[PDB]
Motif scaffolding. Structure first.
Motif, short mmCIF file in Angstrom:
data_model
loop_
_atom_site.label_atom_id
_atom_site.label_comp_id
_atom_site.label_asym_id
_atom_site.label_seq_id
_atom_site.Cartn_x
_atom_site.Cartn_y
_atom_site.Cartn_z
N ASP A 19 0.82 -1.23 0.00
CA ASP A 19 0.00 0.00 0.00
C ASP A 19 0.86 1.28 0.00
O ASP A 19 0.88 2.04 0.97
CB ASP A 19 -1.05 -0.02 1.13
CG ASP A 19 -2.14 1.03 0.94
OD1 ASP A 19 -2.83 1.02 -0.11
OD2 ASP A 19 -2.32 1.87 1.85
N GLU A 21 2.30 4.87 -2.15
CA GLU A 21 1.87 5.96 -3.04
C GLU A 21 2.49 5.88 -4.43
O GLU A 21 3.64 5.46 -4.58
CB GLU A 21 2.19 7.32 -2.42
CG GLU A 21 1.21 7.79 -1.35
CD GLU A 21 1.17 9.30 -1.18
OE1 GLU A 21 2.14 9.99 -1.55
OE2 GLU A 21 0.14 9.80 -0.67
N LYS A 28 5.91 7.53 -2.65
CA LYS A 28 6.29 7.12 -1.29
C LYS A 28 6.47 5.61 -1.10
O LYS A 28 6.00 4.81 -1.92
CB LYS A 28 5.30 7.68 -0.26
CG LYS A 28 5.38 9.19 -0.08
CD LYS A 28 4.40 9.69 0.97
CE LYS A 28 4.22 11.20 0.89
NZ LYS A 28 3.24 11.69 1.90
N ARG A 30 6.81 2.12 1.81
CA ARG A 30 6.41 1.53 3.08
C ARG A 30 7.13 0.19 3.32
O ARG A 30 6.50 -0.87 3.44
CB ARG A 30 4.88 1.38 3.15
CG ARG A 30 4.31 1.29 4.56
CD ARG A 30 2.81 1.04 4.55
NE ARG A 30 2.30 0.72 5.88
CZ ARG A 30 1.06 0.31 6.15
NH1 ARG A 30 0.17 0.15 5.18
NH2 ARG A 30 0.71 0.05 7.40
N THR A 32 8.27 -2.19 5.49
CA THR A 32 8.08 -2.61 6.87
C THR A 32 9.14 -3.65 7.25
O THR A 32 8.90 -4.86 7.20
CB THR A 32 6.64 -3.09 7.16
OG1 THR A 32 5.71 -2.38 6.34
CG2 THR A 32 6.29 -2.86 8.62
N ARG B 36 0.15 0.85 17.62
CA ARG B 36 1.34 0.43 16.85
C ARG B 36 1.79 1.56 15.91
O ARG B 36 0.94 2.23 15.33
CB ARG B 36 1.06 -0.80 15.97
CG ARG B 36 2.19 -1.09 14.93
CD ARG B 36 1.67 -1.57 13.57
NE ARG B 36 2.67 -1.51 12.50
CZ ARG B 36 2.45 -1.79 11.20
NH1 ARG B 36 1.24 -2.17 10.80
NH2 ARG B 36 3.43 -1.69 10.31
N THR B 38 3.78 3.26 12.60
CA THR B 38 4.36 3.34 11.26
C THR B 38 4.04 4.83 10.82
O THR B 38 2.90 5.14 10.44
CB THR B 38 3.84 2.27 10.26
OG1 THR B 38 4.16 2.69 8.93
CG2 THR B 38 2.34 2.12 10.38
N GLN B 40 4.78 7.17 8.13
CA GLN B 40 4.40 8.06 7.04
C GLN B 40 2.86 8.02 6.85
O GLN B 40 2.11 7.43 7.61
CB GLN B 40 5.26 7.87 5.70
CG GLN B 40 5.81 9.21 5.08
CD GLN B 40 6.82 9.18 3.93
OE1 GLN B 40 6.68 8.35 3.02
NE2 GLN B 40 7.81 10.05 3.95
N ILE B 41 2.49 8.74 5.83
CA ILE B 41 1.14 9.04 5.40
C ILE B 41 0.31 7.91 4.86
O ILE B 41 -0.36 8.08 3.83
CB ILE B 41 1.24 10.13 4.34
CG1 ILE B 41 -0.15 10.46 3.85
CG2 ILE B 41 2.11 9.67 3.18
CD1 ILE B 41 -0.17 11.29 2.58
N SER B 42 0.34 6.80 5.53
CA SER B 42 -0.48 5.68 5.09
C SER B 42 -1.30 5.23 6.30
O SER B 42 -2.51 5.04 6.20
CB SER B 42 0.36 4.52 4.55
OG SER B 42 0.88 4.82 3.27
#
Lengths: 50, 52
Positions: A19, A21, A28, A30, A32, B36, B38, B40-42
């Motif tokens: 998910d 951008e 962007k 993510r 993890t 929890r 995390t 950034q913008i998500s």
């Protein structure tokens, strides 16, 4: 003997975002990151990929 | 099976009403009670429900 491993853990891996951008002005990430237990990660040998 | 069963009549509202917004200043509160992290913008870690 003592500065060497005999366990089934890797050395180089590939990490992927979920998910993320995809916009024309901002793209962007993510990543993890969850590094394995009792295992270190050197960051100077760690870089991205286009 | 007609109208009342699945749909209803209501007094109209201009906007969607009061939908719960998830404002935060997360760096300071590690996680209030059940959150929890995390950054950034998500998926920003929530600190409660507020009114938009």
């Amino acid at each position: 003997h003592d500065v060497t491993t005999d366990r089934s853990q890797r050395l180089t891996l590939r990490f992927i975002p979920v998910d993320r951008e995809d916009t024309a002005y901002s793209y962007k990430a993510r990543f993890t990151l969850a590094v394995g237990d009792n295992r270190v990660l050197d960051m100077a040998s760690t870089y991205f990929d286009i | 099976t007609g109208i009342r069963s699945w749909t209803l009549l209501c007094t109209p509202d201009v906007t969607c009403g009061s939908e719960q917004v998830y404002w935060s200043l997360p760096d300071m509160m590690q996680d209030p009670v059940t959150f929890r992290s995390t950054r950034q913008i998500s998926n920003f870690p929530v600190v409660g429900a507020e009114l938009l």
